[PDB]
């Protein structure tokens, strides 16, 4: 079972710290941003501490890690050239970092059209991806299924397929399947997941899902709000999420929790990943999970 969470990529330890944290939570895989999630400032590859991180990963049996590009990248923006241009440059540099880290996929939010419309946004994403995938590296870009909040592109499998069809080196593209996003966009992953996967298989191909994000939601299906909830405490629920985590179609695909910290106030928030992973390995909902995390 490849099951983990996002973990920190920070400090002098960088990737060594990410592997230590993943082991602390009982993880077998993990996902990192290569720096701050909300900006493009990055350290040199030497300072990412990769050699030491890999030794820790081999020590603790960690594999199949995932990189996530900062969520401020928007190569769908047709009216902010500096934003488009920066995203293109950043992603070319992120591919080089990820090749060094040893990840196979970079998760990327397709982008937001910010008023220009889906068609204009999708054409811009295709242009940007065609500028990025001119390296002959092997790293893939995993387009993330999106919730449909605001002007987000990627809220439907059809939008992803249009991006994929426009890209020249589209064999370098994959998909990251996020259970909260698909649910908030309107797909019935709670009660008809196999039906959702059948639709995905028709339109894209389930073999192209190279990362799964495992998140409950604070809102019911189709709310398009994108507010994650702890496993089993939201509108998707434990039975549905547990079914997805252990699903045969996702065998040997890293499954990555992005659930929220638990706490009384913002100064006492604690990570839930250790106990959510225990709960999912047991396949038994623990209604006390939040009370346990809040006092770990
Ligand atoms: Cl697995
Ligand atoms: Cl933007
Ligand atoms: Fe994401
Ligand atoms: Fe996600
Ligand atoms: Zn989200």
Curated annotation (Swiss-Prot):
A biological process from GO:
base-excision repair
GO MF term (any one): DNA-(apurinic or apyrimidinic site) endonuclease activity
Q: What's the catalysed reaction?
A: Endonucleolytic cleavage to 5'-phosphooligonucleotide end-products
EC number of this enzyme: 3.1.21.2
Q: Which residues are noted in the entry as Zn(2+) 3-binding?
A: 181, 226, 228
Free-text cofactor note: Binds 3 Zn(2+) ions.
Note the superkingdom of the native organism. Bacteria
Listed A to Z, the keywords are: DNA damage, DNA repair, Endonuclease, Hydrolase, Metal-binding, Nuclease, Zinc
Return the HAMAP family for the record.
Nfo
Q: What does this protein do?
A: Endonuclease IV plays a role in DNA repair. It cleaves phosphodiester bonds at apurinic or apyrimidinic (AP) sites, generating a 3'-hydroxyl group and a 5'-terminal sugar phosphate.
Q: Which family does it belong to?
A: Belongs to the AP endonuclease 2 family.
* Record-given protein name: Probable endonuclease 4
Q: What species does this protein belong to? A: Staphylococcus aureus (strain MRSA252)
